[PDB]
Amino acid sequence: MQPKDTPELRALYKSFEEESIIPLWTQLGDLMPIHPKSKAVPHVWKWSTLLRLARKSGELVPVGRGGERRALGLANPGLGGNAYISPTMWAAIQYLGPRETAPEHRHSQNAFRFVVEGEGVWTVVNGDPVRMSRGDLLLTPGWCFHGHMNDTDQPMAWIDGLDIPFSQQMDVGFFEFGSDYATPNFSRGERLWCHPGLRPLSGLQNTVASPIGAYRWEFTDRALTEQLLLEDEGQPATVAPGHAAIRYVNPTTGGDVMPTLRCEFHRLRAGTETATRNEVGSTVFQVFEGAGAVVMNGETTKLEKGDMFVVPSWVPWSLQAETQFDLFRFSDAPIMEALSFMRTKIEGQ
Amino acid sequence: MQPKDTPELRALYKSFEEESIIPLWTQLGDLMPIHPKSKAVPHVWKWSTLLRLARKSGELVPVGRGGERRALGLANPGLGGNAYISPTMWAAIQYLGPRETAPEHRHSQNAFRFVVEGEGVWTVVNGDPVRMSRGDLLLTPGWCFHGHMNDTDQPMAWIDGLDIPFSQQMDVGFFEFGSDYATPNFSRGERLWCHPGLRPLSGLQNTVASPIGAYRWEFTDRALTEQLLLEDEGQPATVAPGHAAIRYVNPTTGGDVMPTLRCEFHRLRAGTETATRNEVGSTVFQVFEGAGAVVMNGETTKLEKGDMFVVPSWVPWSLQAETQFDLFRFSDAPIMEALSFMRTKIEGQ
Amino acid sequence: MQPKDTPELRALYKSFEEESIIPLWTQLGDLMPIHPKSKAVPHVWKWSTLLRLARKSGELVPVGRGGERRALGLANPGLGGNAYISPTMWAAIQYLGPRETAPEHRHSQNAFRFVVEGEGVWTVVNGDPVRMSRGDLLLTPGWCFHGHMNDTDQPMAWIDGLDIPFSQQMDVGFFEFGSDYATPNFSRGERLWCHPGLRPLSGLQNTVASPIGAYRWEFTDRALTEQLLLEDEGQPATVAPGHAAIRYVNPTTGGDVMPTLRCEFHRLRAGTETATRNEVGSTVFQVFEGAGAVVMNGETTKLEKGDMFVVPSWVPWSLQAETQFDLFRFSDAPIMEALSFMRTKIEGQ
Amino acid sequence: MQPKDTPELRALYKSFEEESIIPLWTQLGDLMPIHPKSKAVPHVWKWSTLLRLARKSGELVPVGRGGERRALGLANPGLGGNAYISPTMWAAIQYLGPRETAPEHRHSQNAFRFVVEGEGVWTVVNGDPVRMSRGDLLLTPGWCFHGHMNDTDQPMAWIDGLDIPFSQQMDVGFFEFGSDYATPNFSRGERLWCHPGLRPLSGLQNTVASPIGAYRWEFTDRALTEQLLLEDEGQPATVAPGHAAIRYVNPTTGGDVMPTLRCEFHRLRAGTETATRNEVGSTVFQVFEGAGAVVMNGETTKLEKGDMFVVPSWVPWSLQAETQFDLFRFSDAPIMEALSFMRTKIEGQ
Numbered sequence A, B, C, D: 001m002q003p004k005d006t007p008e009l010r011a012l013y014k015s016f017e018e019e020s021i022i023p024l025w026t027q028l029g030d031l032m033p034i035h036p037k038s039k040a041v042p043h044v045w046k047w048s049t050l051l052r053l054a055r056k057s058g059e060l061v062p063v064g065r066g067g068e069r070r071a072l073g074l075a076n077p078g079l080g081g082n083a084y085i086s087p088t089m090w091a092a093i094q095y096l097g098p099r100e101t102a103p104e105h106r107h108s109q110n111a112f113r114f115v116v117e118g119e120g121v122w123t124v125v126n127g128d129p130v131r132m133s134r135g136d137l138l139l140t141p142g143w144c145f146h147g148h149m150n151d152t153d154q155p156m157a158w159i160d161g162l163d164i165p166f167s168q169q170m171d172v173g174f175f176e177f178g179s180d181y182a183t184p185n186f187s188r189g190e191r192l193w194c195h196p197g198l199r200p201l202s203g204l205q206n207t208v209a210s211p212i213g214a215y216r217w218e219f220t221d222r223a224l225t226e227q228l229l230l231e232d233e234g235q236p237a238t239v240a241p242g243h244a245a246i247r248y249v250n251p252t253t254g255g256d257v258m259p260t261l262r263c264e265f266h267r268l269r270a271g272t273e274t275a276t277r278n279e280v281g282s283t284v285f286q287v288f289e290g291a292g293a294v295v296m297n298g299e300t301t302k303l304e305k306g307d308m309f310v311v312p313s314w315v316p317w318s319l320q321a322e323t324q325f326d327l328f329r330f331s332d333a334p335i336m337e338a339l340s341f342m343r344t345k346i347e348g349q
């Protein structure tokens, strides 16, 4: 029950409004809920829809009338009109038309770019051009100048993933505009850092984000395959049966690519069904290849190549593989783990 | 400019709404601002107002009709009706009437309690009673059962500070209800941990929050005084001239009391004016003792004993001491520092 | 068996000597032993002997003819004439006569000074005078200028403990000579750092050694007592029953006082017998107060106030308390733990 | 001067011997030297000598009469007959004859094996066979079962480098004997861990030694080459001009391969002369390929393929490259750095 609804009490309460006081006893339980109950909801975006809307955006929105910001933000139906896939993350399909470019900027927000379709596009990160192609994870960590340049008559689309929504709500955003379109097969960063177990004596200082600008498909495919081959041979390797998986990491540290964002890739042998997990914080997945399904909150949704979905904080989820099922993944887990808020429930266990 | 306002474009845009797409090019700059520009605003609450409203709340709201949650949340005028002092923090004046109690609960949200007026109240934290008195900082870190019990015919008020607003927006909240009202002068925690430079062989494992349940006035006063005395003697000690200051810390680690919240105490020799600072993230201060002023965004506000104010992300601020000026402080700085978002501008420097 | 003792083989072997080759197959097992088997042996030094030899040294060795280096190194009978208590540590009884002084030097070797008998002696550490008295642990960490000055007509003796033997064998030794004999009751360091759970905003940077120059008896006694009182009350605290114990720590970090040396203090309720332990690396203990015994390798030795003993790597040991038994302790454990060589066997467990 | 040589003093001194006391004032300065002055001396071993003595050892010392321990320890002429290359390190040429094997053991001492000549030998490390070939660095970290098996009619030689001398002097040595000779091209470890910037979700826990069992030539060559190519292009990369260099690292951590031992590889463009360095602790180098020289203490020695040399603590050294000069390197630097004893002087700087 509340306090007696008296004239004295309504006066007290008129004073509260005047004085910028809100009394705890008027509040609803869910200011401190039994467990996390997100405003954001589990949602799926069909690739064939995203691709159709992106080609269309490309016709209608050329450069000089919107075309240098041609990204279609996946907006969670529960997040009140904000361009947020979850409370922490932004996820958009950038569509780069034939021969298009962008100038250099920087910002505190951390970003990656995961190539879906296309080749011959370079993103230049602090002056170092990083060739882009299908299955490549690129990084443009906080405060690194990045611009891009298409070298071809062909469109490219990629997932444009950022901690924009965390950064906006917590007030950490900074942004600056900056000052030959070279096309090396491999960036300097990779030429220094993509040799396994080796570290340059000039790179002895640890960094906060990874210095690897592209994690190329090749390597991601080979690791996932070797984990499956090791399963066939009775050797331990997969996280769970028929579930191969790698985390993309900062080689100076062995930790996450950037402070706010985790990236991973999972490959599921056909028939594999994962155990249901409740994880604190939000994750987004994208079907790289194959066919299968997700369950979220008990509800199964069938998935096709390119489809993207979000699991908010604590929503129970699992994946199931009809064919062999490749999935790119990202999450706000390094925020929850850095701050000791992370909890995990797994069904068996 | 935007794309040509054509029927085709309005169709594209009707599809976006249907499909939960929001295009980056429609967005306003301030999704990624030049620097942080908070929705929250600098604001001051006058203690004499908070005290008047608290006594009143005590008459009108007894136990069984709201009285076990008698906290008056300082609500930022810019934060749209949420009981938030800033986007990350909650700050309330809890008013405990004569002989009142509360039962044990726990929650993932981290909390402290800074005693303003009163004595003879124990908060019991995982079964360990912590006597409360004026100038004491108490902790009830995430997931620690806490309840309280007043032992006296006298009211007590304290600042009830939590990371409630961070926890709600990011979805990390959990909460549980729990299962003799002993009155020791000192808690076990303090009996183990409040011996300087000494650590118990049974407490060799590092912890995420501090195990010190009360940081008593005595010690805080003595440290601040010794720093001033050391200044008089030509020895280095103060952070800036006439500006003595301590940070409350976790002795297992030397870091912050809890993962999301920093606490500090500042004592200003009369006449001292601090250099203007822009700091990422938000802080709240409370005048423990003395008289002086704050400048925030260029605007001076005079301050009296008990007055509380908030400096959102990047608002330029300084303090000025007319008499000798004691101030309790807290902030979301460990979140910004844990995630490499922290930046600091200082005027001289 | 060896290779056939042939003229060819003796030639091979004459070549080895010539060429600075020593073949593994000629070596004895104990270049890589089943477990650690120290050259050093368990040994006890009787205080009444150390005191007698120290007074004597004081008569015969005044200043200008040896008296500024009046330390009597405990030399392990197994360590071949080196002034080593163990392979890693040096432990000596420094005897300071009436009014004597020493000038400032520094060195990479880490050092502490544990006051046994005496008062009114200051050691000055980087210009900061640290009053010395009975039961105080003082530090003079690596590379800190230290000199001392006696202020009284009375001798003082203290344990002078260093990582001299580690430093000599591994080649890390550096040494420099340096450039009013003030007598403050408390050093600056302590005035800044001996307030429990508080840290100065000017001391926000972590350090490698502790900045606390004296860990005074007072605090050590109070902690040990509170742990015993907590045992009487059914509260967890002691490491083992009737075994109270603290580790001296670096407050910036919560770790060991200095990188190579651990210090601790143990208080045993009468009747308490500890469980036998095999620990990697060496430790030295000194009976501060009480009467009791040690077992080392199965052999019991009775102990009196001041007596000192060493347990080399892996020697099984325990302590037994006839009266209430106070013991200062140091070891090379931070070297073994830093390098993952530490192992521990305990009898029950 | 000493104390007066009196009968009383000789008595005092007879008591010291009796009582296991050695007085500091009798000691020589160099118990705490101005800077490190090693017992060990700079020394070179000519490969053509090591190879000749190894073939010979192979004839004279077959299996069953010494042949399973056919390693020729490089013994520093200054270290009094111990099989030590420096006070911290052991370095030997293991010579494995046609078809020979060894059974599994383990020990706390950390070890690597750097292949010089040969192929078709597997070392099996905790049951995982690691193919060996020229230029490969293999690890067998502390406490990992390792045995080997030759698969060929051909001898192989490798550098057999351990922290044997540190382990013996400090007393940390443990050793155990253990319980199909499979020949995979690549070990499991490498199949999991040698994909750049990728980490298996089953390997999320940090380790103390690297889990990479072989750092193959291929990768080491490619990194060194790419650093030189990057120099040609005006991009920063080399540690110094014409001086390319990588450190072998633990990918879970980015730190050193094992806690006591650092490994590195340097490639010098012809004509390159390095700046003179004094580094705390000892290092050993082996000419993998090319021709050039070392200066140590001012004395130049010409070097050929395979030649090995040691620079004790603080000996000033530099390398000079007549042709293009490839050098494997190891040191006790992680011990000095872990314990804050490391110091570095460089000539320019």
Ligand SMILES: O=C(O)c1ccccc1O
Binding pocket: A071, A092, A094, A111, A140, A146, A160, B024, B032
């Ligand atoms: O990082 C950027 O360039 C960027 C900024 C805002 C939205 C999408 C993006 O790729």
Ligand SMILES: O=C(O)c1ccccc1O
Binding pocket: A024, A032, B071, B092, B094, B111, B140, B146, B160
């Ligand atoms: O920690 C609590 O008991 C608490 C919970 C919500 C609001 C204010 C509070 O002190």
Ligand SMILES: O=C(O)c1ccccc1O
Binding pocket: C071, C092, C094, C111, C140, C146, C160, D024, D032
């Ligand atoms: O630290 C010193 O002054 C010292 C040096 C050598 C021996 C004993 C000592 O106290």
Ligand SMILES: O=C(O)c1ccccc1O
Binding pocket: C024, C032, D071, D092, D094, D111, D140, D146, D160
């Ligand atoms: O690691 C070993 O097997 C070993 C042990 C002693 C000497 C040389 C060695 O390779």
Ligand SMILES: [Fe+2]
Binding pocket: A105, A106, A107, A111, A146
């Ligand atoms: Fe950007």
Ligand SMILES: [Fe+2]
Binding pocket: B105, B106, B107, B111, B146
């Ligand atoms: Fe609570």
Ligand SMILES: [Fe+2]
Binding pocket: C105, C106, C107, C111, C146
């Ligand atoms: Fe000294």
Ligand SMILES: [Fe+2]
Binding pocket: D105, D106, D107, D111, D146
């Ligand atoms: Fe071995």
